[PDB]
Amino acid sequence: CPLMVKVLDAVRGSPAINVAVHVFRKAADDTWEPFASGKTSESGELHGLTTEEEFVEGIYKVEIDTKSYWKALGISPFHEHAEVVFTANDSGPRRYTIAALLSPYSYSTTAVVTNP
Amino acid sequence: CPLMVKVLDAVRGSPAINVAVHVFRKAADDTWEPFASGKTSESGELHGLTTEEEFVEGIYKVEIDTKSYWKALGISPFHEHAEVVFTANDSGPRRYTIAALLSPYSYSTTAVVTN
Amino acid sequence: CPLMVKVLDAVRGSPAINVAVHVFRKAADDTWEPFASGKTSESGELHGLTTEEEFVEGIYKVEIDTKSYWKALGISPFHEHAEVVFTANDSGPRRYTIAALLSPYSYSTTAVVTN
Amino acid sequence: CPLMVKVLDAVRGSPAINVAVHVFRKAADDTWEPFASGKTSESGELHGLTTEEEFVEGIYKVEIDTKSYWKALGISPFHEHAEVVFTANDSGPRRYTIAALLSPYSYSTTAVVTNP
Ligand SMILES: O=S(=O)(c1ccc(O)cc1)c1ccc(O)cc1
Ligand SMILES: O=S(=O)(c1ccc(O)cc1)c1ccc(O)cc1
Ligand code: NA
Ligand code: NA
């Protein structure tokens, strides 16, 4: 599990449950190719998106579908989604945790990068 | 004025209006002494808290009454207030902007220090 | 101007100066079309991006070139850039301020929408 | 473990290690009485501050010694510390996670509150 996503809800003070996440990887023709997807669990975490073999060097985009999350709770938010774009594994394999904190008109995102 | 406070509301995407703000200065006996206070304007800003003459080096605390703000909007908050504690240091001319972004169970605060 | 961008630096406690910002509008064929761009000023702000005539309802993306900013300061960043994607909706007069607070491995963004 | 503290470093993209944390509780005379203290581990987490029996109703202050953290890394930060003040257990026992994200001139704090 070299890529994990955590999401928290700043209005409720709780994990953000059932948040859809789509990961893309930039292809040779400079388009975003679908790479992996999933949803956050009751703990707000999304595990098992990829494997060490599959998660090669590249530029990755982690799209967090924040609008669908808020609308399912009856709230009209500002952003369409949160996009996190980064180069991965350029100095060898690393483990990446993408963390996000959500409010209807604001969000924060952090990266925790560790070396196995 | 060398000290200004700005407060934003992350739930409504708006300035945080009519928020009470209290500034304290640390006295020699280690207690917090009232220094200045006010309420944020329609733009979420509080100007005119102090003057360069009065804002000497020392430790200051800015207390933002976030609980009352959320209660007035019918929203149940977590924190009693937001506290920002910092040292004022002289080191050339200095303007201090204390910014805060409020959510019911979260807040962020930033210091913008400019010449 | 109905759209403004503000960028702050959380490491130095200062405006983020000379940061490139690109705005795109979603076209009918689902691609991102260049719409406006500029560089943040000494106050970290980018004004005059568009006009009320041109800023019609639709989906917009604001791209902040954070990687170049940190590299110019000798700091190694994580993100390629910061992207802010939102729908502009009419619903009375509307000013949009897109604010961003930058750290090397983190960023926050807020929308302040005022009448 | 009804009270836990997590701290992340936004400059390094890593847990904030060896951050001192002091917890206080408002006493009957309206002073802050020392309640518990500890330091974050290599994971950035501080466990074992208190017990269900000890952690009664009250107003609590969690002081995170951010200045000492940055100065130990050779950085001159803005804030003296981060203070998180809240009423706890007013509707019965809850579990509280205080999370913080640190930059030299900025910090964010969130609360995750769950019911056992
Ligand atoms: O979800 S968090 O608590 C988190 C904790 C440890 C990690 O390695 C990653 C995320 C969190 C994330 C961001 C934030 O601003 C506050 C808490
Ligand atoms: O740039 S800010 O100070 C700002 C203040 C008032 C506004 O109406 C708009 C922007 C700012 C930016 C980010 C943040 O988290 C807090 C304050
Ligand atoms: Na290489
Ligand atoms: Na009660």
Distance (angstroms) between ligand 2 centre and the Cα of C8 equals 8
Both tokens assigned to B57:
């080096």
Torsion angle (degrees, nearest 10) of CA C73, C76, C79, C81: 20
Interface contact A10-B12, CB threshold 8 A: no
> After which residues is the backbone of chain D broken at C–N > 2.5 Å?
none
Interface contact D8-A99, CB threshold 8 A: yes
**Cβ neighbourhood burial of B48 (10 Å; 0-12, 13-18, 19+):** exposed
What are the helix (H) ranges across D2-114? 66-72
Region of A71 please: left (phi>0), alpha (psi -120 to 50) or beta. Answer: alpha
- Give yes or no for a contact between A35 and A86, defined as CB atoms under 8 angstroms apart: no
The whole-angstrom distance between residue C36's C-alpha and the CA centroid of its chain comes to: 10
Name residue B109's amino acid: T
Strand C58-64 and strand C79-88: pairing? antiparallel
Resolution (A): 1.6
Measured in degrees and rounded to the nearest 5, phi and psi for residue D7 equal -135, 135
SS (H, E, C) chain D: CCEEEEEEECCCCEECCCCEEEEEEECCCCCEEEEEEEECCCCCEECCCCCCCCCCCEEEEEEECHHHHHHHCCCCCCEEEEEEEEEECECECCEEEEEEEEECCEEEEEEEEECC
Q: What is the C-alpha to C-alpha distance for residues A116 and A71, in angstroms, rounded to an integer?
A: 38
Q: Where are the beta strands (DSSP E) in chain A?
A: 3-9, 14-15, 20-26, 32-39, 45-46, 58-64, 79-88, 95-103, 106-114
Mutate which of A14, A17, A43, A101 for ligand 1? The one with the most ligand atoms within 8 Å of its CB, which is: A101
Q: What is the C-alpha to C-alpha distance for residues A111 and A6, in angstroms, rounded to an integer?
A: 10
* Annotated binding residue C108: yes
Interfacial B residues in 94-113 facing A (CB < 8 Å): 101, 103-106, 108
- For ligand 1, atom 14, the nearest C-alpha belongs to D101
Q: What is the C-alpha to C-alpha distance for residues D63 and B68, in angstroms, rounded to an integer?
A: 22
- For ligand 2, atom 12, the nearest C-alpha belongs to C99
The whole-angstrom distance between residue A111's C-alpha and the CA centroid of its chain comes to: 10
What are the helix (H) ranges across chain C? 66-72
Interface contact D110-A10, CB threshold 8 A: yes
B:C CB pairs within 8 Å: 31
Q: What is the C-alpha to C-alpha distance for residues A1 and B22, in angstroms, rounded to an integer?
A: 47
- Give yes or no for a contact between C50 and C34, defined as CB atoms under 8 angstroms apart: no
Task: Name the residue in chain C with its Cα closest to that of B15.
Answer: C112
Tokens 């959510």 identify what position? B103
- Give yes or no for a contact between C102 and C7, defined as CB atoms under 8 angstroms apart: yes
- Give yes or no for a contact between B84 and B100, defined as CB atoms under 8 angstroms apart: yes
User: Coil, helix or strand for C71?
Assistant: helix
Distance (angstroms) between ligand 3 centre and the Cα of D102 equals 29
**Cβ neighbourhood burial of B98 (10 Å; 0-12, 13-18, 19+):** buried
Name the DSSP letter for residue A48: -
- Give yes or no for a contact between C63 and D66, defined as CB atoms under 8 angstroms apart: no
Q: What is the C-alpha to C-alpha distance for residues C99 and B15, in angstroms, rounded to an integer?
A: 12
Q: What is the C-alpha to C-alpha distance for residues B39 and A38, in angstroms, rounded to an integer?
A: 45
Q: What is the C-alpha to C-alpha distance for residues A100 and C37, in angstroms, rounded to an integer?
A: 27
Selection from B63, B49, B60 nearest residue B20 by Cα: B63
- Give yes or no for a contact between D99 and D109, defined as CB atoms under 8 angstroms apart: yes
- Give yes or no for a contact between A58 and A25, defined as CB atoms under 8 angstroms apart: yes
Selection from C62, C60, C65 nearest residue C26 by Cα: C60
- For ligand 2, atom 3, the nearest C-alpha belongs to B99
Q: What is the C-alpha to C-alpha distance for residues C86 and C63, in angstroms, rounded to an integer?
A: 12
Q: What is the C-alpha to C-alpha distance for residues B50 and C84, in angstroms, rounded to an integer?
A: 37
Domains by residue range for chain A, with CATH = 1-116 (2.60.40.180)
CB atoms within 10 A of CB B95: 13
The whole-angstrom distance between residue D89's C-alpha and the CA centroid of its chain comes to: 17
CB of B4 within 8 Å of a chain C CB? The answer is no
Interface contact C108-B101, CB threshold 8 A: yes
What are the helix (H) ranges across C6-65? none
Region of B58 please: left (phi>0), alpha (psi -120 to 50) or beta. Answer: left
Interface contact A110-D15, CB threshold 8 A: no
Q: What is the C-alpha to C-alpha distance for residues D87 and D95, in angstroms, rounded to an integer?
A: 13
Interface test with B, best of C112, C113, C114, C115 (most B CBs within 10 A): C112
Name residue B41's amino acid: S
Name the DSSP letter for residue D18: T
Q: What is the C-alpha to C-alpha distance for residues D84 and B79, in angstroms, rounded to an integer?
A: 7
Q: What is the C-alpha to C-alpha distance for residues C1 and B64, in angstroms, rounded to an integer?
A: 32
What are the helix (H) ranges across chain A? 66-72
Interface contact B110-C13, CB threshold 8 A: yes
- Give yes or no for a contact between D29 and D20, defined as CB atoms under 8 angstroms apart: no
Q: What is the DSSP string of chain B?
A: --EEEEEEETTTTEE-TT-EEEEEEE-TTSPEEEEEEEE--TTSEE--S--TTT--SEEEEEEE-HHHHHHHTT---SEEEEEEEEEE--SS--EEEEEEEEETTEEEEEEEEE-
Measured in degrees and rounded to the nearest 5, phi and psi for residue C17 equal -95, 140
Residues of A in contact with B9 (CB under 8 A): 105
CB of B15 within 8 Å of a chain C CB? The answer is yes
Both tokens assigned to B21:
């703000």
Torsion angle (degrees, nearest 10) of CA A8, A11, A14, A18: -60
Which one of B13, B106, B108 has the shortest CB-CB distance to A105? Answer: B13
Provide CB contacts within 8 A for D53, sequence distance 6+.
none
User: Coil, helix or strand for A35?
Assistant: strand
Name residue B19's amino acid: V
Which one of C81, C107, C113 has the shortest CB-CB distance to A109? Answer: C107
Q: What is the C-alpha to C-alpha distance for residues D44 and D20, in angstroms, rounded to an integer?
A: 11
- Known binding residues of B: 6, 45, 108
Q: What is the C-alpha to C-alpha distance for residues C94 and C40, in angstroms, rounded to an integer?
A: 22
- Give yes or no for a contact between C34 and C24, defined as CB atoms under 8 angstroms apart: yes
Å between D27 CA and nearest CA of chain A: 26
Residues of A in contact with C64 (CB under 8 A): none
Q: What is the C-alpha to C-alpha distance for residues A103 and B102, in angstroms, rounded to an integer?
A: 10
Q: Where are the beta strands (DSSP E) in D43-78?
A: 45-46, 58-64
